[PDB]
Design a protein around this ligand. Structure first.
Ligand code: NI
Length: 414
């Protein structure tokens, strides 16, 4: 009757499950109760954060929620646990279900330097905020690593919960802790009583909302990234390149130019990383690939470099188009380091929101004239991120100002 298998054998699953006793929530697997709704909350979690490929769970006892979040493909999970018993139980659960895309670490979140972990797309704080003696600092530490699925409790109001370090948690001190942490975009999904109450909120800080709009609209002004110096060096090198055709007498296949009397107008420097640059190293700065990584996916590689130029007065517009249409949405993005201030009357970016989520075969003039054609204002230093499927264009620059921009294409190696 024996000497056979199981549909790891269920006998061995029973042995190692009984070996790690006691279990706090038990352990079931394929129907059988071995020891005495995470998938639902996980689907809600990905409904709140759709493009998450680098999630970080906090307080992953037994890995119940961890396994749930690891179901979605292309996902990498780091789960931190305080007690090593629960850690070995969770490691066991991952071993059984075959979740090879999960790392479980033993770490106390109360005395942990959160900068060591890195940057994460989303953070799951499921039922532990009411275990720390100062939860606001926990939320702040969460903000340093762009979105949180918080599921916690709160206390009515009437009874005075003193006033400790600026916070009374009640509801006011909760939303004030999330606000002071950095999460400016808060959405309550589920929630009251005179004493113990429950609440489940979603939080997006700066860069997080930028991800939301980049996914919905297809383009975002993600502000600056560099800490002084290198941007002005990029501008100086760029003007150093424009002076080759203008001030000197340069000519090559990468100086794209186009009637009578007036000199040919230069509008694009193709293959910018390959040209004679003293500052092309700045094209490989980690902040750029890190930003494009935060918007697209974690492993990003720069695929194309270019320098688009709007000369003063003479510069004409660029027709509306999609850069590439043979890729899935939210897969390849363009970053645009704006070396000059750009306004609607200066030849700045214009996009049709949501056009990146349209089919492959389209008629560009219909999408263009249909609209809306919304402009993307930018200051010198801002970085514009947009999807390659986005239908985008601009008008001409008839004013005295230049309008120079560095465009770099970041894509997933797949
Ligand atoms: Ni384009």
């Amino acid at each position: 009757h024996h000497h056979s298998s199981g549909l790891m054998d269920r006998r061995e699953i029973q042995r190692r499950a009984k070996e790690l006793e006691p279990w706090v929530n038990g352990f079931e697997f394929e129907g059988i109760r071995y020891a005495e709704d995470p998938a639902d909350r996980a689907r809600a979690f990905y409904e709140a954060f759709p493009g998450a490929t680098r999630i970080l769970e906090l307080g992953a006892l037994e890995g119940a929620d961890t396994l749930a979040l690891a179901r979605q493909p292309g996902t990498s999970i780091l789960g931190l646990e305080g007690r090593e018993e629960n850690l070995r139980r969770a490691e066991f659960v991952m071993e059984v279900h075959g979740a090879t895309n999960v790392e479980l670490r033993i770490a106390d979140v109360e005395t942990l330097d959160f900068a060591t972990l890195g940057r994460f797309d989303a953070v799951l704080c499921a039922g532990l905020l009411y275990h720390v003696r100062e939860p606001w600092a926990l939320l702040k530490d969460a903000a340093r690593v762009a979105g949180i699925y918080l599921s916690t409790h709160y206390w009515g109001s009437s009874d005075g919960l003193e006033t400790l370090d600026g916070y009374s948690l009640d509801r006011a001190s909760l939303f004030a802790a999330l606000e002071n942490a950095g999460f400016v975009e808060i959405e309550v999904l589920h929630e009251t009583s005179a004493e113990v109450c429950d609440i489940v909120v979603v939080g997006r800080a700066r860069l997080g909302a930028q991800i939301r709009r980049f996914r919905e609209d297809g383009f975002v002004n993600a502000g600056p990234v560099f800490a002084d110096d290198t941007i002005a060096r990029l501008k100086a090198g760029a003007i150093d390149l424009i002076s080759r055709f203008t001030e000197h007498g340069h000519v090559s296949d990468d100086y794209w130019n186009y009637v009578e009397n007036e000199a040919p107008v230069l509008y694009r420097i193709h293959n910018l990383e390959k040209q004679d640059w003293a500052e092309r190293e700045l094209l490989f700065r980690p902040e750029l690939a890190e930003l494009a990584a935060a918007f697209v996916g974690s492993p990003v590689v720069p695929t194309a470099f270019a320098l688009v130029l709007k000369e003063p007065k003479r510069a004409a517009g660029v027709p509306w188009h999609r850069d590439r249409a043979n890729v899935a949405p939210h897969t390849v993005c363009n970053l645009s380091i704006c070396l000059d201030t750009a306004g609607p009357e200066n030849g700045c970016l214009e996009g049709v929101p949501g056009s990146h989520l349209l089919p492959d075969d389209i008629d560009v003039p219909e999408i263009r004239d249909g609209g809306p054609r919304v402009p993307v204002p930018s200051k010198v230093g801002d970085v514009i991120v947009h999807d390659v499927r986005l239908v985008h264009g601009s008008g001409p620059n008839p004013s005295d100002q230049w309008r120079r921009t560095i465009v770099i294409e970041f894509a997933n190696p797949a």
